[PDB]
Design a protein around this motif. Structure first.
Motif, PDB file in Angstrom:
ATOM      1  N   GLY A   1       0.563  -1.537   0.065  1.00  0.00           N
ATOM      2  CA  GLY A   1      -0.221  -0.086  -0.085  1.00  0.00           C
ATOM      3  C   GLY A   1       1.367   0.958  -0.102  1.00  0.00           C
ATOM      4  N   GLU A   2       0.980   1.596  -1.106  1.00  0.00           N
ATOM      5  CA  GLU A   2       2.380   2.621  -1.765  1.00  0.00           C
ATOM      6  C   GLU A   2       1.475   4.178  -0.879  1.00  0.00           C
ATOM      7  OE1 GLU A   2       4.581   4.857  -1.207  1.00  0.00           O
ATOM      8  OE2 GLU A   2       6.120   4.095  -2.189  1.00  0.00           O
ATOM      9  N   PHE A   3       1.817   5.423  -0.568  1.00  0.00           N
ATOM     10  CA  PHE A   3       0.987   6.301  -0.563  1.00  0.00           C
ATOM     11  C   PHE A   3       1.395   7.636  -1.427  1.00  0.00           C
ATOM     12  CE2 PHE A   3       0.165   3.836   3.945  1.00  0.00           C
ATOM     13  CZ  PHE A   3      -0.885   4.275   3.899  1.00  0.00           C
ATOM     14  N   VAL A   4       0.092   9.167  -2.527  1.00  0.00           N
ATOM     15  CA  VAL A   4       1.358   9.164  -2.946  1.00  0.00           C
ATOM     16  C   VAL A   4       0.203  10.485  -2.689  1.00  0.00           C
ATOM     17  CG1 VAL A   4       1.776   7.985  -4.570  1.00  0.00           C
ATOM     18  CG2 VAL A   4      -0.497   7.628  -3.829  1.00  0.00           C
ATOM     19  N   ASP A   5       0.707  11.323  -3.178  1.00  0.00           N
ATOM     20  CA  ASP A   5       0.197  13.503  -3.619  1.00  0.00           C
ATOM     21  C   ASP A   5      -1.440  12.890  -4.068  1.00  0.00           C
ATOM     22  OD1 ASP A   5      -0.625  15.735  -2.892  1.00  0.00           O
ATOM     23  OD2 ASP A   5       0.423  16.327  -4.955  1.00  0.00           O
ATOM     24  N   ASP A   6      -2.251  11.588  -4.485  1.00  0.00           N
ATOM     25  CA  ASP A   6      -3.148  11.158  -4.467  1.00  0.00           C
ATOM     26  C   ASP A   6      -3.907  10.359  -4.246  1.00  0.00           C
ATOM     27  OD1 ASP A   6      -4.171  10.255  -8.089  1.00  0.00           O
ATOM     28  OD2 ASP A   6      -4.248   8.971  -6.534  1.00  0.00           O
ATOM     29  N   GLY A   7      -3.699   9.716  -3.596  1.00  0.00           N
ATOM     30  CA  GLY A   7      -4.675   8.923  -2.480  1.00  0.00           C
ATOM     31  C   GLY A   7      -3.390   7.804  -2.260  1.00  0.00           C
ATOM     32  N   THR A   8      -3.994   6.964  -1.976  1.00  0.00           N
ATOM     33  CA  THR A   8      -3.360   4.923  -2.284  1.00  0.00           C
ATOM     34  C   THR A   8      -3.191   4.818  -3.394  1.00  0.00           C
ATOM     35  OG1 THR A   8      -4.328   5.493   0.468  1.00  0.00           O
ATOM     36  CG2 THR A   8      -3.399   3.299  -0.217  1.00  0.00           C
ATOM     37  N   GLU A   9      -1.938   3.470  -3.529  1.00  0.00           N
ATOM     38  CA  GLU A   9      -1.801   3.336  -4.259  1.00  0.00           C
ATOM     39  C   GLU A   9      -0.972   1.438  -4.157  1.00  0.00           C
ATOM     40  OE1 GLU A   9       0.575   4.666  -7.367  1.00  0.00           O
ATOM     41  OE2 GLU A   9      -0.895   6.166  -8.397  1.00  0.00           O
ATOM     42  N   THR A  10      -2.718   0.641  -3.724  1.00  0.00           N
ATOM     43  CA  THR A  10      -2.465  -1.334  -3.631  1.00  0.00           C
ATOM     44  C   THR A  10      -1.363  -1.865  -5.245  1.00  0.00           C
ATOM     45  OG1 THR A  10      -3.648  -0.912  -2.077  1.00  0.00           O
ATOM     46  CG2 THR A  10      -2.861  -3.148  -2.850  1.00  0.00           C
ATOM     47  N   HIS A  11      -0.185  -1.758  -4.628  1.00  0.00           N
ATOM     48  CA  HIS A  11       0.498  -2.049  -5.654  1.00  0.00           C
ATOM     49  C   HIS A  11       0.874  -3.493  -6.124  1.00  0.00           C
ATOM     50  CE1 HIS A  11       2.568   1.234  -6.921  1.00  0.00           C
ATOM     51  NE2 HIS A  11       2.103   2.217  -6.816  1.00  0.00           N
ATOM     52  N   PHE A  12       0.117  -4.514  -6.672  1.00  0.00           N
ATOM     53  CA  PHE A  12       1.163  -5.921  -7.389  1.00  0.00           C
ATOM     54  C   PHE A  12       1.522  -6.333  -8.359  1.00  0.00           C
ATOM     55  CE2 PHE A  12      -3.084  -6.964  -8.679  1.00  0.00           C
ATOM     56  CZ  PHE A  12      -3.966  -5.985  -8.303  1.00  0.00           C
ATOM     57  N   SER A  13       1.419  -7.436  -9.012  1.00  0.00           N
ATOM     58  CA  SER A  13       2.042  -8.391 -10.676  1.00  0.00           C
ATOM     59  C   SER A  13       1.330  -9.224  -9.995  1.00  0.00           C
ATOM     60  CB  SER A  13       3.334  -8.210 -10.449  1.00  0.00           C
ATOM     61  OG  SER A  13       3.892  -7.195  -9.977  1.00  0.00           O
TER      62      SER A  13
END
Length: 89
Positions: free
Chosen positions: A41-53
């Motif tokens: 769960g990355e946090f950005v100047d936008d909201g959150t980005e839950t990364h996976f592959s």
């Protein structure tokens, strides 16, 4: 109210297969074809980005804090930096 944590489902057509993604908002846990996969769960100047592959394809659920209140987060699946809309079944 009540159905506030209502899950989002996406389909991904990749490598001749179709994968169902379901984000469980209760735990911020993501099912791919009914099995959970690993997430960060990355946090950005936008909201959150839950990364996976999935295979070679990187994916992230953008969870945009677009609402002015502390709630009203827009959830979208992105894959290979392209936007994937939730199901319309």
């Amino acid at each position: 109210e009540d159905r506030s944590k209502t899950t989002n489902t996406w389909v991904l057509h990749m490598d001749g297969e179709n994968f169902r993604i379901v984000l469980e908002k209760d735990a911020m846990d993501v099912w791919c074809n009914g099995k959970k996969l690993e997430t960060a769960g990355e946090f950005v100047d936008d909201g959150t980005e839950t990364h996976f592959s999935i295979g070679n394809h990187d994916c992230y659920i953008k969870a945009v804090s677009s609402g002015k209140r502390k709630e009203g987060i827009i959830h979208t699946l992105i894959v290979d930096n392209r936007e994937i809309p939730e199901i319309a079944s």
